[PDB]
Structures are given as structure tokens and as C-alpha cells.
Structure 1
Amino acid sequence: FLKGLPVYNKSNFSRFHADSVCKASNRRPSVYLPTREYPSEQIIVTEKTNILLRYLHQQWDKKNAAKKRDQEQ
């Protein structure tokens, strides 16, 4: 049948309930208010070179390396 649904832990939702008719505006998660500063391993940076300029530069380097094939086959 359509049901033989994933079980990550049989205990999950086995003791669940709040038992109320269509109502729960509970913002139970405590807000995270950071004070401690921890360094970053990396900084995400965008490549400044234009896509056309990048392509024309590498395509010319492909053509040049193909010409440096000299002194036999």
C-alpha cells in the first residue's frame, strides 16, 4: 500500500499533544541575541572580470597553446 512511510525514530511524535480546537500562536523559540564575535574562515567574493572578456581571453590562450605544439607532432 501507499503507506509504509519513513521511520527515523519510532519515539518521534508518540507522546505528542496540545489538545485545543484550531489555535496555537506560541512563539516558544527563545530569540537568539548574539554578543560574542567569532571569526569567519571565508569571505564570499564575486569575480570582477566580464563574461565576454573572460571567454575571449581563455579562448585565445587555448589557440596560443595549440600553436606552441611545435618541434614535431
Structure 2
Amino acid sequence: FLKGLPVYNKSNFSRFHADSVCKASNRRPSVYLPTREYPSEQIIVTEKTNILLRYLHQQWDKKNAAKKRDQEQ
């Protein structure tokens, strides 16, 4: 059949109950007020070189290596 759905745990949703019908504006999660400072490992940065300027630069570096490998045939 279409059913036989995954089970990460049989206990999940086995004791769930809410004595209400179509009413739940409870924003139960307590808000997080961070006051402690913990440094970051990395810093996300963008490559400033233009995409065309980058392509023309590496293509010229590959064209030089094709001619600069003539010490040996």
C-alpha cells in the first residue's frame, strides 16, 4: 500500500494531546537574549576580481604553460 511510513522513534506523538479545537496562538518557545561573546572561526568574503578579468588571466596562464614546457619535448 501507499502506507508503511518511516519511524525515527515509536514513542514520538504517542502521548501528544491538546484539549482544544482549531485554536493555538501559543508562542511557547522562550526568546533567546544573547549576552555572551564567542568568536567566529571563519569570515565569509567575496572574490573582488571580475569574472571576465579572472577568465582571461587564467586562460593566458594556461597558454603560457603550454609553450613554457618546451625544455623537454
Give TM-score, length-normalised by structure 2: 0.96
Structure 1's consecutive aligned runs of 4 or more residues displaced over 4 angstroms after TM superposition are none
User: Which stretches in structure 1 are left out of the alignment for 5+ residues?
Assistant: none
Distance in structure 2 (CA, Å) of the matches to 1:69 and 1:40: 44
CA RMSD of aligned residues (A): 0.7
Deviates more, 1:31-40 or 1:13-22: 13-22
Note the C-alpha offset of 1:32.
0.2
Specify every segment of 5 or more residues in structure 2 that has no aligned partner in the other structure, as ranges: none
User: How many pairs were matched up?
Assistant: 73
List aligned pairs for 1:26-65, cutoff 5 A.
26-65=26-65
TM-score after normalising by structure 1: 0.96
Matched position secondary structure for 2:3: coil
Question: What is the SS of the residue equivalent to 1:53?
Answer: helix
**SS of residue paired to 1:17:** coil
